[PDB]
Amino acid sequence: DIQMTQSPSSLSASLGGKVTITCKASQDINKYIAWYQHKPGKGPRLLIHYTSSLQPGIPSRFSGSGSGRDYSFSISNLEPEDIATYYCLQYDNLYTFGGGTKLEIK
Amino acid sequence: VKLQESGGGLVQPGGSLKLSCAASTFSSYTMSWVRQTPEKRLEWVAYISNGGGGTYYPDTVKGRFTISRDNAKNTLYLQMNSLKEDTAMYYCARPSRGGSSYWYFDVWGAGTTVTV
Amino acid sequence: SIGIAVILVGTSDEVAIKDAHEKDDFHHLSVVPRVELVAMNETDPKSIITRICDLMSDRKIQGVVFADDTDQEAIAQILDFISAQTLTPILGIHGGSSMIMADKDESSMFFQFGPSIEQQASVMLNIMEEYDWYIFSIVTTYFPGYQDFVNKIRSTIENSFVGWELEEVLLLDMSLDDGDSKIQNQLKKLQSPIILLYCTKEEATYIFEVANSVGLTGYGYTWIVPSLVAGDTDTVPSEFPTGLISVSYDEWDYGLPARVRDGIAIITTAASDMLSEHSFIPEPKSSCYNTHEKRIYQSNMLNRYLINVTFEGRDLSFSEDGYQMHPKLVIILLNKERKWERVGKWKDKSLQMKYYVWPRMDDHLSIVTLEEAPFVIVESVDPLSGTCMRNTVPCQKRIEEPGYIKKCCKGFCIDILKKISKSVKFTYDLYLVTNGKHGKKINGTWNGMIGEVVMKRAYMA
Amino acid sequence: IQNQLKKLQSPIILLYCTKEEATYIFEVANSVGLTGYGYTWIVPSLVAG
Amino acid sequence: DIYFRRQVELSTMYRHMEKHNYESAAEAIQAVRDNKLHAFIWDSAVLEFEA
Amino acid sequence: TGPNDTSPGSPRHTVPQCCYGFCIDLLIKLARTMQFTYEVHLVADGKFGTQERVQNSNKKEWNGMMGELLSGQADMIVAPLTINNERAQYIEFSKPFKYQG
Amino acid sequence: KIVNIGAVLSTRKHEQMFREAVNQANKRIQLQATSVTHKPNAIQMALSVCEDLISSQVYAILVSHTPTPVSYTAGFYRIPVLGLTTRMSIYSDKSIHLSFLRTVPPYSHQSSVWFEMMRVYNWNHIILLVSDDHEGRAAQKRLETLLEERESKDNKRGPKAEKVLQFDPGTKNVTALLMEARELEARVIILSASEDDAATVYRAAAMLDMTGSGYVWLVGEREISGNALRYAPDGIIGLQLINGKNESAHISDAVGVVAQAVHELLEKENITDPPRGCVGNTNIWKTGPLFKRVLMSSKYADGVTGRVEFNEDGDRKFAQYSIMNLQNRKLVQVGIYNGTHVIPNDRKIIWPGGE
């Protein structure tokens, strides 16, 4: 089956910085992308659809671009109720997942 | 419709713990669930279709796991064996737009832990 | 996985259509479907194509199922063009495409309708072999593809036992639609009881005015009014008497979501056949305006697979463009100024019709008889046709059961009655006695044939 | 005259009338198509002389 | 078989003929002499020689 | 040249056979009269030629011998072949040898 | 009263022929202009339909010289008959197009051109090779419509041919069919196939020596390309149409027959107009049959090189030919054709192979 690998290992940024995390799968995904964020012990929150379509209730702080099998997802202007950890999903075959990173604030 | 997990534990070292997530229409809705690493990674566990068929896993927990579901009580059933190096939290997630296919959920569960 | 897109255009209920398929458990198969709904107030051709191929890049769509509230004679024929351009299957029943006959391409991947127009003529033959109706006249205008059709129903000879009885085909040019100097000079052949008429609704609206102008009204009815050509029973003008005898499958579709689920099962079965025999999934096309060649050569195994697939006791082997052998067919009853409905049943060879008499715009007798030596001989029916050739009678024997099979009667008195019928004017209702007590008087009453005489049952004996 | 026809598919038709009403009825017979067929048979000379 | 299917008055006879026909002349000629077939119809210029 | 179906079930083995009789003697006289080189090969099945609607379609082929006359397998038929209205639609005959019934 | 004129192919002929043609038809009743060329093939050229038709299709249908996709897209909208100098055989299919009219005879229309050959050099032994396409069946139907003539009431009504074949294996098998066709005594060959199939029957006739003496060949249109494809020395007879390569004479006779049709339609009263755009609209417009009527009832002697007429299907009705034959590798021109007249020669016929 297809396997994914996110990267790398860190979200070291200040209040209102800029970070970007990459969806990297083993096979062509045709922009099959999602993005989730959660606190430790709270539960995920949907971000992103096919064309980086954001969610009602999710602010415009989150954008992204990419295609084929490689996607980038950028977070900026971050308020610390989003102390979270960001994760990418592909569903070409049934579901796919990689590593992903956690957020720290300095 | 809301999702609520139950059956949390890892009380036998190397045992088998059938966890579940009940729902309150889920019969045309597939199921696949998530453990969390100390690196918090939302790694996949199993795959069922809405109709009980399509029994699959990712490469992490293959070879040991016995899988089923019941759309009458709206619950999942899978025994955890190879989570024995993790202090994981598990939640259930019901993917949107129904079918035997998969789509993008906002329909996730509540989140409960499995601790050894 | 494979990609199946459904599109509905025009006002419909996508909930019953959604719910019908999402309970169909397509497991026990190797591949599973992928539905995609798209609605409907947008009705230009270019928007339709540029919407289909507008989508066709994000999702792997293997094809499109469109709808029954459009007019498909127009746009839809170009589907075989785009189909051969895209190598993707398109099925369906729907809309204005009611039995479309054309010279579609060889590399198109699409089947549609149900029976052919000649298989329709074959069931029209089984209809005329129910009441031994014999064609005295055919009248068809010069369509681009009518005259071959009639010259094939003409060349489908019927072997004797029966009158083969053509006597006139009539091709009339409706360009020069002079109903005075053309339709009058082509008539006079209407002194005959059966006239076939294969046309469209608008030119029937013209030609029924011409037929009313000459006097083709009384005579009763004028015979074949093919429903599948000019299919709008609700808004047909009616400038004639009753009409609408004929056949379509177009029962108001109790089965339309079942047709969608059956078609999905057909596609999934074909893909399962490809996975059982070769296993490889051809990837669907991903564009329309850009790099439009899109893995240009593809295995022609799918056209062969689209025909070899059948669904359990229901779907037929799908060979001629979409012209099947035994789909369910219906028969319609008979007035257009009072929107009458279906009165017949057809299933896979058989016809069941619940009128039994021809209306006409008292000489009807019941007649009760008795089997004996060679005056009224009772024999069984043919095991291939049901009816009787030389015997020419029902003899509806009761068991009661006036639906017991119409046993053939021969002999001398029947040959006398068949001359006496043409002698004055008759109509039979021929049946046998049941109590078996012909010509007997017991205390109070009579039995048998005289028993059905004393019971005043509109009789002869 | 149209409802009384259709009996003209036959080769012999007798017609006993006057000249003026024949002038009317021959227009009606031309209007229906009673031309070819050849001739229409008895044209009694002594009436419309 | 052409003369019988052409005729309408003999049609019932032909319908009785459809279940017992043979493929060759000698087959029916031998089958008449074995009393399995009481009669046979063919041309005079062969049957009058065979008799 | 005999048929391939020398034993009229399965096998197909054509052999040189030998013939003699009435039509052979008259053919001898006609070939000697009209300078004919000729070959004689027997028929496929032995069903005298008839017409029927075959292949559940609008096609009427001629079974047996007359189809082989129509298909160019021969150019003359010298056999006890009767005269009918249906065979003589497009097949020219001669003055017919005999009178029988 | 300022009509429009469409065009589809390329930017040399739009410059003559278009600004000059609006001024030519302005003597009638005024015209102007929009035109485009359509550079890619399938469906990208079908994409740009009704980017030009937004107000052109009230008064003009784009016309010019595989020519088949845009005719299907812009033939949906109840679009009357167009004359375009194509190579559509499939233009006698009057349901699937309400819009075609040839200005050049099709691939099958060489058949009556053959039928007039039956009189001069009356020969009655013909093997006619015919491909298994729909084109071949159409040509077959036309040549059988030609065979079913001379029904009154001198040894024959005409030459009825030996037989025809069907010939599915174009690129695979010619030897078995030709081995059977050698036996039939006929010496006249009618061959209607592709030019690569002509370069193939170049093999099997040379191996069977069925190209020598007596063997008269009657090829279709796509044998004059085959001389390049490497086809056998002489006695083959071929035909060739008057200019279909000097397209200025075509666009000129096109502008003459459309100026006559615009002037003929402009003199009437109930010329209702189609709606504009293609924005959800249906151009269901009662003067469509009237366009066919106005074209079908007028002649067309106007032009530069010859009388051009139109049939009920949309053919030219006239057969103007230079007839060639390759006399040792070169196409010498022999007499010419003109409908029903004589074929006036000016050269000598060799004869096939030896003699």
Author numbering:
A (entry chain N): 1 to 106
B (entry chain M): 2 to 25, 28 to 87, 89 to 120
C (entry chain B): 34 to 394, 403 to 440, 448 to 509
D (entry chain D): 216 to 264
E (entry chain A): 711 to 761
F (entry chain A): 458 to 558
G (entry chain A): 25 to 52, 58 to 94, 103 to 190, 205 to 406
Excerpt from the paper describing this PDB structure:
N-methyl-D-aspartate receptors (NMDARs) belong to the family of ionotropic glutamate receptors (iGluRs) that are involved in the majority of fast excitatory neurotransmission. NMDARs form heterotetrameric ion channels composed of the obligatory GluN1 subunits and GluN2 (A-D) and/or GluN3 (A-B) subunits. All of the subunits contain an amino-terminal domain (ATD), a ligand-binding domain (LBD), a transmembrane domain (TMD), and a carboxyl-terminal domain (CTD), which interact with each other in defined manners to mediate functions including channel gating, allosteric modulation, and cellular signaling. More recently, a number of studies on intact tetrameric NMDARs showed that the subunits are arranged as a dimer of GluN1-GluN2 heterodimers and that domains and subunits move in discrete patterns to control channel gating and allosteric modulation.
Toward this end, we purified the intact GluN1b-GluN2B NMDAR proteins in the presence of 1 mM glycine and 1 mM glutamate and complexed them with the purified Fab2 fragment. We subjected the GluN1b-GluN2B NMDAR-Fab2 complex, but not the GluN1b-GluN2B NMDAR-IgG2 complex, to cryo-EM since the former showed higher sample homogeneity, which resulted in electron micrographs with evenly dispersed particle distribution. Single-particle analysis resulted in three 3D classes that differed from each other mainly in their ATD conformations. The resolution of the 3D reconstructions ranged from 3.9 to 6.6 Å as estimated by Fourier shell correlation (FSC) curves, thus, the quality of the cryo-EM density maps was mostly sufficient to identify and trace secondary structural elements as well as the side chains of bulky residues. The cryo-EM structures unambiguously showed that Fab2 binds to the R1 lobe of the GluN2B ATD. One heterotetrameric GluN1b-GluN2B NMDAR channel is capable of binding two Fab2 fragments at the equivalent region of the two GluN2B subunits. The single-particle cryo-EM showed density for the ATD, the LBD, and the TMD of the GluN1b-GluN2B NMDARs along with the density for the Fv portion of the Fab2 fragment, which interacts only with the GluN2B ATD. The closed GluN2B ATD bi-lobe disallows sufficient reorientation of the GluN1b-GluN2B ATD interface to cause rolling of the GluN1b-GluN2B LBD heterodimers, thus, the channel gate is closed. Allosteric inhibitors such as zinc stabilize closed GluN2A and GluN2B ATD bi-lobes by binding at the inter-R1-R2 cleft and tethering residues from the R1 and R2 lobes. Thus, GluN2B ATD bi-lobe closure induced by Fab2 is mediated by a different mechanism, likely involving long-range interactions.
